Design an enzyme around this catalytic site. Sequence first.
Site, PDB file in Angstrom:
ATOM      1  N   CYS A  30      10.120  -9.132  -0.116  1.00 19.14           N
ATOM      2  CA  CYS A  30       9.673  -8.212  -1.149  1.00 19.14           C
ATOM      3  C   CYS A  30      10.835  -7.604  -1.935  1.00 19.14           C
ATOM      4  CB  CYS A  30       8.824  -7.125  -0.506  1.00 19.14           C
ATOM      5  SG  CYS A  30       8.196  -5.903  -1.653  1.00 19.14           S
ATOM      6  N   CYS A  33      10.464  -3.881  -2.860  1.00 17.01           N
ATOM      7  CA  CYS A  33      10.646  -3.041  -1.682  1.00 17.01           C
ATOM      8  C   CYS A  33      12.125  -2.708  -1.507  1.00 17.01           C
ATOM      9  CB  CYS A  33      10.114  -3.729  -0.430  1.00 17.01           C
ATOM     10  SG  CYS A  33       8.321  -4.139  -0.469  1.00 17.01           S
TER      11      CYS A  33
END
Length: 105
Positions: A30, A33
């Site tokens: 991700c 993230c």
Amino acid sequence: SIIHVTDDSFDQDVLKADKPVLVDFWAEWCGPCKMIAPILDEIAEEYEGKLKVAKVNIDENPETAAKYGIRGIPTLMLFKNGEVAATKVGALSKSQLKEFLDANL
């Protein structure tokens, strides 16, 4: 203050916490993230009197991901009193994160 939480400890660390808990659902794949991680590091310090920050890796913790319907990440969920007070899906800036917390704490 940031703790890494697992399926086995989620009840204790998040649901039974004495303060609101902001849960960061993340994984290695991700990119956004990773972009928000340094913001959470700062927020965890700045809001330490008001809030506990927890990270849950969704690849390693399928029970919690399933239970809370975590489908795409980043997902942030603010817990109060053992219950979800607010959810944000997708990255946001530091100023945006502070708006979210200030309104939902």
